[PDB]
Curated annotation (Swiss-Prot), chain A:
Highest taxon, organism lineage: Eukaryota
Other comment: Present with 5910 molecules/cell in log phase SD medium.
Function of the molecule: Component the THO subcomplex of the TREX complex, which operates in coupling transcription elongation to mRNA export. The THO complex is recruited to transcribed genes and moves along the gene with the elongating polymerase during transcription. THO is important for stabilizing nascent RNA in the RNA polymerase II elongation complex by preventing formation of DNA:RNA hybrids behind the elongating polymerase.
Full-protein residues shown: 99 to 147 of 392
Organism: Saccharomyces cerevisiae (strain ATCC 204508 / S288c)
Compartments in which it is found: Nucleus
Subunit structure: Component of the THO complex, which is composed of HPR1, MFT1, THO2 and THP2. Together with SUB2, TEX1 and YRA1, THO forms the transcription/export (TREX) complex. THO associates with DNA and RNA in vitro.
Protein name per UniProt: THO complex subunit MFT1
UniProtKB/Swiss-Prot annotation, chain B:
Name used for this protein in its record: THO complex subunit THP2
Record's subunit section: Component of the THO complex, which is composed of HPR1, MFT1, THO2 and THP2. Together with SUB2, TEX1 and YRA1, THO forms the transcription/export (TREX) complex. THO associates with DNA and RNA in vitro.
Additional free-text comment from the UniProt record: Present with 2840 molecules/cell in log phase SD medium.
Signal sequence interval, chain numbering: none
Source taxon at top rank: Eukaryota
Native source species: Saccharomyces cerevisiae (strain ATCC 204508 / S288c)
Its job: Component the THO subcomplex of the TREX complex, which operates in coupling transcription elongation to mRNA export. The THO complex is recruited to transcribed genes and moves along the gene with the elongating polymerase during transcription. THO is important for stabilizing nascent RNA in the RNA polymerase II elongation complex by preventing formation of DNA:RNA hybrids behind the elongating polymerase.
Location in or out of the cell: Nucleus
Length: 49, 52
């Protein structure tokens, strides 16, 4: 079983990449909030509209 | 009787000699560690890729 591992490298690889994508999206989501909060501050500090 | 007497002793002596020899052989076999058996694997590249 240790001899033949070229045949089992793909599947794990897939999961790895998939996991990466998920992180990306989540990161993006946080970035999104960090803009809208900022815009709300705009409304609080005086008038800027 | 005496023919069987001086045959039983030979058989028993030989039996104990083999018992000693097989104890020795087993103890010699048990010292081979895993790395010795695993040094002969063909392609390390795929293995390293796997573990990384």
């Amino acid at each position: 079983k240790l001899e033949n591992l070229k045949d089992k490298l793909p599947d794990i690889k897939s999961i790895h990449s998939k996991l990466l994508l998920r992180i990306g999206k989540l990161q993006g989501l946080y970035d999104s909030v960090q803009v809208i909060n900022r815009e709300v501050e705009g409304l609080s500090e005086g008038r800027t509209s | 009787l005496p023919d069987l007497h001086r045959e039983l002793i030979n058989s028993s002596i030989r039996l104990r000699y083999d018992k000693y020899q097989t104890r020795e052989a087993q103890l010699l076999e048990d010292t081979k560690t895993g790395r010795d058996v695993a040094a002969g694997v063909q392609n390390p590249k795929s293995i390293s890729e796997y573990y990384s």
